Swiss-Prot record:
The keyword Ribonucleoprotein does not apply. Belongs to the bacterial solute-binding protein 7 family. Changing residue 127 to A: Complete loss of incorporation of N-acetyl-beta-neuraminate into the LOS. This is Sialic acid-binding periplasmic protein SiaP. It comes from the Bacteria. InterPro entries: DctP_fam, TRAP_DctP, TRAP_DctP_sf. Gene3D superfamilies: Bacterial extracellular solute-binding protein, family 7 (3.40.190.170). Part of the tripartite ATP-independent periplasmic (TRAP) transport system SiaPT involved in the uptake of sialic acid (N-acetyl-beta-neuraminate). This protein specifically binds sialic acid with high affinity. N-Acetylneuraminate (sialic acid) can then be incorporated into the lipooligosaccharides (LOS) as a terminal non-reducing sugar, protecting the bacterium from complement-mediated killing by normal human serum. Its main location: periplasm. Is essential for lipopolysaccharide (LPS) sialylation and serum resistance. One of its GO terms (cellular component) is outer membrane-bounded periplasmic space.
Amino acid sequence: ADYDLKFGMNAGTSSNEYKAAEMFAKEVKEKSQGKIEISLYPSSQLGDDRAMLKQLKDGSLDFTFAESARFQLFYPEAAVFALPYVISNYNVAQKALFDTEFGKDLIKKMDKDLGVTLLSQAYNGTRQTTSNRAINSIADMKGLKLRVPNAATNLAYAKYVGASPTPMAFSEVYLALQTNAVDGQENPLAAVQAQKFYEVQKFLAMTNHILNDQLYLVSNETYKELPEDLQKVVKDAAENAAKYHTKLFVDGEKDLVTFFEKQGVKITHPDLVPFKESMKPYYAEFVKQTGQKGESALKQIEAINPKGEA
Ligand SMILES: CC(=O)N[C@H]1[C@H]([C@H](O)[C@H](O)CO)O[C@](O)(C(=O)O)C[C@@H]1O
């Protein structure tokens, strides 16, 4: 309580994100000798992730989560992180962020322009598509009222596969599915579990369309008033928590399809060839809109070997 800090998130109390944030908070409290306590504010209590990023910038929130892709709000070429099917796996997401000129520059800009320090990166799952009717092929997407987050890349996923997107905040999704205001949504398996979307969706299709990472971010305004030994406690704990976070997601992606089947969900495996082909005009539009910086980011990312960590 020398430093009463706050960590906001969209994810709820049953999520991997929350579990990993709990680990982070406990380690920081212990290794700071009680000087720092981090309280958690889940379920978008503080607003969504766009709002919480603004709060880090202003200094009114100390920690939050964001995807690398979310920075497309400020640097359009950063949409590359969530162009469907472009990033192959988490290894590529890691090397894109830390081992390309594009990624390194993004991290610097987040510090300089946006008032946030990137502490660590974790895996947050690969997005899949749930619905109230089976998705056996891309044909079943046509006219599907697909909820998406308020993010351009997810809206484009829905548009280009032929669905009818309805954007809304994460907090609103359960009701929309339950009432069939929409016919489906798309999120990684762990979120379908955490939010209990399986209670209100009979089908899950392995569309494998967007790879989510997760950044542990701190407000520069907060981090500057921690003496360096406490900065180190916070950084080391964020790195430890990110490895745990990733493991929770990796382990669940092995186990969760059976969990859902046990809950009465039918799992489909549509041919993804047409899904990937449908994105080609979107990639062209991305390059048009974002120009040389976008074409460069895409080339840098496509060059990455998806085999091997680092
Ligand atoms: C860090 C964070 O808040 N991630 C959230 C993401 C991103 O907001 C979105 O992918 C755009 O970047 O949206 C969800 O998946 C969603 O609303 O379905 C909830 C998830 O908790």
